[PDB]
């Protein structure tokens, strides 16, 4: 620490004010909030005849009169005042850029297209090419980073992801300590192997502009929120972690009582499916910052699994009391109605929350689940599709499609959808088993076993493996490996001893088949032993086992 | 003329004239149904000529130029199905049927990709 | 004076069906080698 923390305070004060100056609410909100957690430097390149336009442009933007700002700055030769016009020009188009299909679902009304950004993108390229000083060398300043960041997000709109990375990384090199720029960098990955490749780029190829930044900040490893970058990537997708635990500790010692870190830290418990510890960590945040509403839908999601409706209802009452039209408020309320089995009304509030941001967390997927319980099976599959388009890293979106298509007669579609989600979260025990069950329709029995044998290993606890053991024998019966059927269906019989003789229905079929098989093999004494082992179940199995027992005794 | 010479199954003078047209208009007409059309046609000639490699790149650059187009996605899926890259073609197919409702040929090609996915047993 | 859309042609039915048939050939002959 020592002067390192003091050096952060001064420079973080900069990122809080200049970013707020040029109408970037999201980035400045994080930076300003980081001042409170952490335990008037002014300057800009402007002339008196041009400084008025910035006041003119800023105050019209604040009054939310977006379009008139564009006209009043029709010509601006300032290096980075042009960004403010172009930013307003972009958002003016975006609010009316609603896809026709997606709009029917998000509203339910059931009733020039994109050429603007093509001109918007071309303008940025034209301005930069004709600009005096490029990104190279120790030139450039904060203002140029905004232009490149704006250029990057427009590029992501046309799904030019490959070039989008180059623009964003180029903006961050010029100016660091901009949080909103890195959020858009998250959505560019949509894969696991590139993250380490991108990590290699930062460690070797990437370099910072020390001219703008303060001391001990050009270096990548002494930088503080490069850890924030590493923290975010390894929670969205686990993969293989590099220094994840060590750098997390250092960031925890700094930034005391920082609510975002605690919410992130507790979200790890939810990702690890440790609900009991998740509530305790979440609850402390509520006491500290009652009026913070971000990432509160995760709190409702955790409470939904525990089904603590009494606790959940008060959370909805408390959340809705202070604010009634933020996306997390409506999402929590919509989650509440589901607990009351009113799946038909939860869509309404999920619908309302979506119209607020239209790029949220997994609120699209939760909308799809509520349709499934209504047996619509067609709104859900298309509702699930929209979540795929926005965030292709969402496990639940892909799984919902494969699960929904499983109910549908055509199971062949479900294989591909499960395969993609399989790569995203290979650690889940359910997805491997469900993939194998749907994959048996394919008729290629060999690959199912490689999937099936991975399901049992990933299933951890052995008692749930009794059900899938019977599936292994059934598939092996389709091949000339009836002996292999015996050994595995013997294994589930052994698990009965481990499970204190639960003698469930699954082992009832397991025991009777083995007596029948051993009878066919001439081992009457052995088959007689399992004959009395089926002492419970349906009447027919009791009668059949007694017939096997009666038969075995005659041949002894 | 390039289309004309493509129609008579010559596939050499068509390519030459289309390439000449494209080098003439390298500087101007970045969009607006002229660069898109010529590059798409040249890629289609390359596809029929079985030179799929450069076809991949030209179809990709057209796709990144303009993205809402079912024909480009269907042709790229066909190009991938010509090789063995089914993992990177089923997504393009699905996007193509998302963009345009029927696409009967695209539906048949996607169905064939499904039977391939059933047959293959890759890890 | 206005120019209409220039002539562009896409995948016909005959060539895609021929590729379907060839694709069936190659997913039909290899399992004979396996068996």
Swiss-Prot record, chain A:
TPR repeat locations: 145-178, 225-258, 259-292, 293-326, 327-360, 361-394, 395-428, 429-462, 466-499
Pathway: Protein modification; protein ubiquitination
Keyword list, A-Z: Cell cycle, Cell division, Centromere, Chromosome, Kinetochore, Mitosis, Nucleus, Phosphoprotein, Repeat, TPR repeat, Ubl conjugation pathway
Consequence of substituting residue 37 to D: In CDC23-54; G2/M cell cycle arrest at 37 degrees Celsius
Outcome of substituting residue 88 to N: In CDC23-6; G2/M cell cycle arrest at 36 degrees Celsius
Subcellular location: Nucleus; Chromosome, Centromere, Kinetochore
Pfam families with a match to the protein in the record: ANAPC8, TPR_11, TPR_8
Source superkingdom: Eukaryota
Cellular component GO terms held in the UniProt record: anaphase-promoting complex; kinetochore
Result, substituting residue 256 to L: In CDC23-49; G2/M cell cycle arrest at 37 degrees Celsius
A GO term for molecular function: cyclin binding
InterPro entries: APC8 (IPR007192), TPR-like_helical_dom_sf (IPR011990), TPR_rpt (IPR019734)
Changes after translation: Phosphorylated by CDC28, which is required for the early mitotic activity of the APC/C in its CDC20-bound form.
PANTHER family noted in UniProt: CELL DIVISION CYCLE 16,23,27, CELL DIVISION CYCLE PROTEIN 23 HOMOLOG
Other comment: Present with 80 molecules/cell in log phase SD medium.
Assembly, per entry: The APC/C is composed of at least 13 subunits that stay tightly associated throughout the cell cycle: APC1, APC2, APC4, APC5, APC9, APC11, CDC16, CDC23, CDC26, CDC27, DOC1, MND2 and SWM1. CDC23 interacts directly with SWM1 and binds the destruction box (D-box) of the substrate cyclin CLB2.
Role of this protein: Component of the anaphase promoting complex/cyclosome (APC/C), a cell cycle-regulated E3 ubiquitin-protein ligase complex that controls progression through mitosis and the G1 phase of the cell cycle. The APC/C is thought to confer substrate specificity and, in the presence of ubiquitin-conjugating E2 enzymes, it catalyzes the formation of protein-ubiquitin conjugates that are subsequently degraded by the 26S proteasome.
Membership in a protein family: Belongs to the APC8/CDC23 family.
Stated name of the protein: Anaphase-promoting complex subunit CDC23
Name of the gene this protein is made from: CDC23
Swiss-Prot record, chain B:
Entry coiled-coil feature ranges: none
Subcellular location: Nucleus
Post-translational modification: Phosphorylated by CDC28, which is required for the early mitotic activity of the APC/C in its CDC20-bound form.
TPR repeat ranges, renumbered to this chain: 1-27, 33-65, 70-99
Domain of life of the source: Eukaryota
Role description: Component of the anaphase promoting complex/cyclosome (APC/C), a cell cycle-regulated E3 ubiquitin-protein ligase complex that controls progression through mitosis and the G1 phase of the cell cycle. The APC/C is thought to confer substrate specificity and, in the presence of ubiquitin-conjugating E2 enzymes, it catalyzes the formation of protein-ubiquitin conjugates that are subsequently degraded by the 26S proteasome.
Record's miscellaneous remark: Present with 2753 molecules/cell in log phase SD medium.
Family indicated by similarity: Belongs to the APC6/CDC16 family.
Complex and partners: The APC/C is composed of at least 13 subunits that stay tightly associated throughout the cell cycle: APC1, APC2, APC4, APC5, APC9, APC11, CDC16, CDC23, CDC26, CDC27, DOC1, MND2 and SWM1. Interacts with AMA1.
Record-given protein name: Anaphase-promoting complex subunit CDC16
Native source species: Saccharomyces cerevisiae (strain ATCC 204508 / S288c) (Baker's yeast)
Residue numbers of the full-length protein present here: 639 to 761 of 840
UniProtKB/Swiss-Prot annotation, chain C:
Modified residues (Phosphoserine): 12
GO biological process: anaphase-promoting complex-dependent catabolic process; cell division; chromatin organization; protein ubiquitination; regulation of meiotic cell cycle; regulation of mitotic cell cycle
Key words of the record: Cell cycle, Cell division, Mitosis, Nucleus, Phosphoprotein, Ubl conjugation pathway
Any one GO CC term of the record: nucleus
The keyword Cytoplasm appears for this protein: no
Residue ranges crossing the lipid bilayer per the database entry: none
Main location: nucleus
Subcellular location: Nucleus
Primary role: Component of the anaphase promoting complex/cyclosome (APC/C), a cell cycle-regulated E3 ubiquitin-protein ligase complex that controls progression through mitosis and the G1 phase of the cell cycle. The APC/C is thought to confer substrate specificity and, in the presence of ubiquitin-conjugating E2 enzymes, it catalyzes the formation of protein-ubiquitin conjugates that are subsequently degraded by the 26S proteasome.
Subunit structure: The APC/C is composed of at least 13 subunits that stay tightly associated throughout the cell cycle: APC1, APC2, APC4, APC5, APC9, APC11, CDC16, CDC23, CDC26, CDC27, DOC1, MND2 and SWM1. CDC26 is required to tether the essential subunits APC9, CDC27 and CDC16 to the complex.
Family per record: Belongs to the CDC26 family.
Protein name: Anaphase-promoting complex subunit CDC26
Organism: Saccharomyces cerevisiae (strain ATCC 204508 / S288c)
Gene label: CDC26
Portion of the full-length sequence here: 1 to 35 of 124
